[PDB]
Amino acid sequence: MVKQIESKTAFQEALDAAGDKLVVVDFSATWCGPCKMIKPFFHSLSEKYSNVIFLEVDVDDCQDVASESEVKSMPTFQFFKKGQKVGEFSGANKEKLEATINELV
């Protein structure tokens, strides 16, 4: 299951309720084709890795969160453990996404 985030408070609350778990956040936009192409694979990871928390943030819904997160290229994947950012990259690269998860979990 992928968390759909629709405020900065929900984002912060999610990072807090994570406990010690890896949190993976997909920042995407509706105009970003590859963002829409990777979305099912993103959902698959959330079903596969029930141990890891997956969130989606749409940058035009959550402009504050998008700005604060210093997002530049769509999609961007950020990774958190205990409220701290422990990884980031951009681009719809499935293999890299999963590899990154396995390094951080």
UniProtKB/Swiss-Prot annotation:
For the modification S-nitrosocysteine, the affected residues are C62, S69, S73
| Modified sites of kind N6-succinyllysine | K8, K94
Please give an example of a GO cellular component term from this record.
nucleus
The keyword Membrane belongs to this UniProt entry's keyword annotation: no
Q: Impact of altering E70A?
A: Strongly reduced interaction with CASP3
Site positions (Deprotonates C-terminal active site Cys): D26
**One GO molecular-function annotation for this sequence?**
thioredoxin-disulfide reductase (NADPH) activity
Q: Which Pfam families match?
A: Thioredoxin
Residues covered by the Thioredoxin domain: 2-105
The protein's site described by Contributes to redox potential value is found at G33, P34
Enumerate the subcellular locations listed in this protein's record, separating them with semicolons.
Answer: Nucleus; Cytoplasm; Secreted
CDD domains tied to this protein: TRX_family
Disulphide bonds in the chain:
C32-C35
Provide the alphabetized UniProt keywords: Acetylation, Activator, Allergen, Cytoplasm, Disulfide bond, Electron transport, Nucleus, Redox-active center, S-nitrosylation, Secreted, Transcription, Transcription regulation, Transport, Ubl conjugation
Q: Does the keyword Metal-binding apply?
A: no
**What does the induction field say?**
Up-regulated by ionizing radiation.
PTM annotation, UniProt: In case of infection, ubiquitinated by S.typhimurium protein slrP, leading to its degradation.
Summarizing the annotation, the consequence of altering D60N is:
Loss of pH-dependence of dimerization
Q: Which residues form the active site?
A: C32 (nucleophile), C35 (nucleophile)
Q: Which PANTHER family match?
A: THIOREDOXIN-LIKE PROTEIN 1
Its biological function? Participates in various redox reactions through the reversible oxidation of its active center dithiol to a disulfide and catalyzes dithiol-disulfide exchange reactions. Plays a role in the reversible S-nitrosylation of cysteine residues in target proteins, and thereby contributes to the response to intracellular nitric oxide. Nitrosylates the active site Cys of CASP3 in response to nitric oxide (NO), and thereby inhibits caspase-3 activity. ADF augments the expression of the interleukin-2 receptor TAC (IL2R/P55).
User: What does the subunit comment say?
Assistant: Homodimer; disulfide-linked. Interacts with TXNIP through the redox-active site. Interacts with MAP3K5 and CASP3. In case of infection, interacts with S.typhimurium protein slrP. Interacts with APEX1; the interaction stimulates the FOS/JUN AP-1 DNA-binding activity in a redox-dependent manner.
**Full protein name:** Thioredoxin
What organism does this protein naturally occur in?
A: Homo sapiens
Gene behind this chain?
Answer: TXN
